[PDB]
Amino acid sequence: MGSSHHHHHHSSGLVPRGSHMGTHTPDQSTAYMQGTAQADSAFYLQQMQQSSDDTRINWQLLAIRALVKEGKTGQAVELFNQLPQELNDAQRREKTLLAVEIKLAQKDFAGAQNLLAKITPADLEQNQQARYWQAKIDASQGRPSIDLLRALIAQEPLLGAKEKQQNIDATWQALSSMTQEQANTLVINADENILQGWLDLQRVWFDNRNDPDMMKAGIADWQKRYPNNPGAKMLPTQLVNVKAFKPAST
Structure with missing residues (x-):
């Protein structure tokens, strides 16, 4: 071989x-x-x-x-x-x-x-x-704290207007559960647009849910303040719960 x-x-x-x-x-x-x-x-x-x-x-x-x-x-x-x-x-x-x-x-x-x-x-x-x-x-x-809003807001630009409804909801899922004082004690981002903005809405929510004439209007109020905010273009159900709220005289 x-x-x-x-x-x-x-x-x-x-x-x-x-x-x-x-x-x-x-x-x-x-x-x-x-x-x-x-x-x-x-x-x-x-x-x-x-x-x-x-x-x-x-x-x-x-x-x-x-x-x-x-x-x-x-x-x-x-x-x-x-x-x-x-x-x-x-x-x-x-x-x-x-x-x-x-x-x-x-x-x-x-x-x-x-x-x-x-x-x-x-x-x-x-x-x-x-x-x-x-x-x-x-x-x-659903932990009532900024990092929720901080987070789904955060993905809002990344996602869709279809995911926004989600974002909007999960954001509000902070605001509606979070406290004014919590909201008032939060730590916002660098953008500092949407986050504290969202809270202004719960600020009106915290008082206005069961007070329709000012809630929906407070909703349509905040959305003017922060049109920039995903919610100001489409608003969550829990503030919308004025619509969804009890009898409103009319």
Whole structure:
């Protein structure tokens, strides 16, 4: 026989990622982060183990995200363990997004906001805001506090006028449950448009629900004050509950 290339041969030749992959922006990996591409945690997981260092985590941005949507939290956690604690400033956010949807399944809702607090939406992707926000609202389960309004308002630009009704409602789901004083003690954003604005409406609501002539008018009042506010273009049902309210003399 001739000598071709016969040497040690443990396996066919599995080449592991000894590289961290250069910093080039993804094509699919972010598509699923956009909602422009669809796949399972399984895919995000399937590539993760096959991918390079920062790409493992990069794929896990999706993987964990998806996994805890699926409901599997500790499954999301175990590979959450896999992603870095200390990324770049924006990439930090990208994994911390996951931490939230994890906590949300852990009923660590407080811890979820805790992570949401580390993240900056004005920093991440517009859509990764919404991904982040949907984890925020979830942490604000109807928890009468600003971070609810802060959150669904926050996704309002990201979403639709069809999701707005939702936003509008979940926002009001703070205002109607939140207190004037709470509302008055809240912490608003940088935009500081919609958030405190929303409250003005509950301010009138807190007094006016069962006082129709001023409630609906107070509604139509606030909406003038903050037309900018999603609610001022379409108003929630709980203030609308003046319509829906008791007998109104006419």
